[PDB]
Structure formats: C-alpha cells, structure tokens
Design a protein around this ligand. Sequence first.
Ligand SMILES: Cc1cc2nc3c(=O)[nH]c(=O)nc-3n(C[C@H](O)[C@H](O)[C@H](O)COP(=O)(O)O)c2cc1C
Ligand SMILES: C[As](C)(=O)[O-]
Ligand SMILES: [Zn+2]
Ligand SMILES: [Zn+2]
Ligand SMILES: [Zn+2]
Ligand SMILES: [Zn+2]
Length: 117
Amino acid sequence: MLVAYDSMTGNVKRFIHKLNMPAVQIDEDLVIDEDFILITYTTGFGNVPERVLDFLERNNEKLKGVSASGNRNWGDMFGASADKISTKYEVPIVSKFELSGTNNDVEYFKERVREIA
Ligand SMILES: Cc1cc2nc3c(=O)[nH]c(=O)nc-3n(C[C@H](O)[C@H](O)[C@H](O)COP(=O)(O)O)c2cc1C
Ligand SMILES: C[As](C)(=O)[O-]
Ligand SMILES: [Zn+2]
Ligand SMILES: [Zn+2]
Ligand SMILES: [Zn+2]
Ligand SMILES: [Zn+2]
C-alpha cells in the first residue's frame, strides 16, 4: 500500500523511511491514483497542517486511513489531527505516535495497514 505523508521538521519523514514502503511526499499538484494511507503531523491545538488539509480536499476518495505524529505533552490534543481527518472522511485512525516513532510504532503501523488493505 501507498503511503502519502507530509513533514515540516523531518520527524514524519524519518518515520516513513523506517517503513520501507512505497511512499510519496504531498505537494500541490499531486493526484493519487490508488488507495493510500496518510501520515500527518499535528499543529498547535490539535490541528491538521494546511498543506495536508489542501491535499485532502482534492484526494480524500482514495484515503483509507490516517496516522498522526504528535507529542503527548499536548495531552488530549495528542495526534488530534488524525481524529479530525478520521471523523470528517470516515476512515480509521491507523495509529498515533510521538515524534519520529519507536520501532514498535513502525511495526504496529505496518500490521494495521495490512489489516485495512
Ligand atoms: C508549535 C507546535 C505545536 C504542536 N502542536 C501539537 C498538538 O497540538 N498535538 C500534538 O500531538 N503534537 C503537537 N506538536 C508536535 C508535532 O506534531 C511533532 O513534533 C511532530 O513529530 C512534527 O512532525 P514533523 O517533524 O514531521 O513536522 C506541535 C509542535 C509544534 C512545534
Ligand atoms: C523520495 As522520499 C521517500 O524521501 O519522499
Ligand atoms: Zn528519502
Ligand atoms: Zn488551504
Ligand atoms: Zn483550503
Ligand atoms: Zn484537553
């Protein structure tokens, strides 16, 4: 399965290189042709980065799940970008992880995508 992602300070980018899966960085022209999983980071107060919101307005029909990178020091706003995406588009939250993730976060993501695919 194809993974689409965005990263501002490189933590999500580090995570997706640990997956060894087909992966594409989001941009303004990208149209995705097949089922995909989104990995986003989380902006202040539980939000979705604008570039990701823009991409999803165009690409949500093929979206099959979302994961968020965040930080537990945000409390119940931890990874809430995934909550908002999941609620809006009616897709599962694959996983939440902190920062660039642990090895267990990597393996869990892959097991959950295998289940959804
Ligand atoms: C200004 C700022 C606000 C953030 N707000 C949240 C938040 O509301 N919830 C959360 O879980 N993480 C939050 N984070 C943490 C980031 O989502 C986290 O560092 C993430 O790994 C960044 O991914 P990136 O390095 O790929 O850009 C915030 C980080 C910054 C610098
Ligand atoms: C070409 As890539 C996997 O660093 O987005
Ligand atoms: Zn690379
Ligand atoms: Zn916009
Ligand atoms: Zn917009
Ligand atoms: Zn709260």
